[PDB]
Amino acid sequence: PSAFFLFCSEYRPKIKGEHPGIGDVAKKLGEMWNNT
DNA sequence: CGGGTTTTTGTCTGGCTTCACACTTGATTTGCATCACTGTGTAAGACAGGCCAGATC
Numbered sequence: 664p665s666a667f668f669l670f671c672s673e674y675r676p677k678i679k680g681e682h683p684g685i686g687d688v689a690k691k692l693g694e695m696w697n698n699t
Numbered sequence: 700c701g702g703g704t705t706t707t708t709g710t711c712t713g714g715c716t717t718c719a720c721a722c723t724t725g726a727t728t729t730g731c732a733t734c735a736c737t738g739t740g741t742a743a744g745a746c747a748g749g750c751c752a753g754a755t756c
Contacts, residue, residue, distance in 0.1 A: 690723085
């Protein structure tokens with residue numbers, strides 16, 4: 664486990680509520696994680 | 700020579716499981732080339748005994 668893995672496991676429901684479908688969801692997650 | 704008998708070949712409707720990108724990134728191990736350092740088989744390389752012929756009193 665790493666910081667990115669923890670952030671993903673913590674904010675996956677965010678992308679879930681945002682878009683159902685997870686290419687674009689994971690892309691946006693990685694983008695916002697690299698931004699923050 | 701034509702017909703019969705297996706044998707294999709599929710059908711839609713509706714219903715189960717089941718492996719694969721898709722990014723996501725950043726560690727992990729995986730693999731081939733490189734590094735340190737000698738022992739040795741092998742081929743170049745003089746080398747002196749032997750065999751000579753040219754030579755002098």
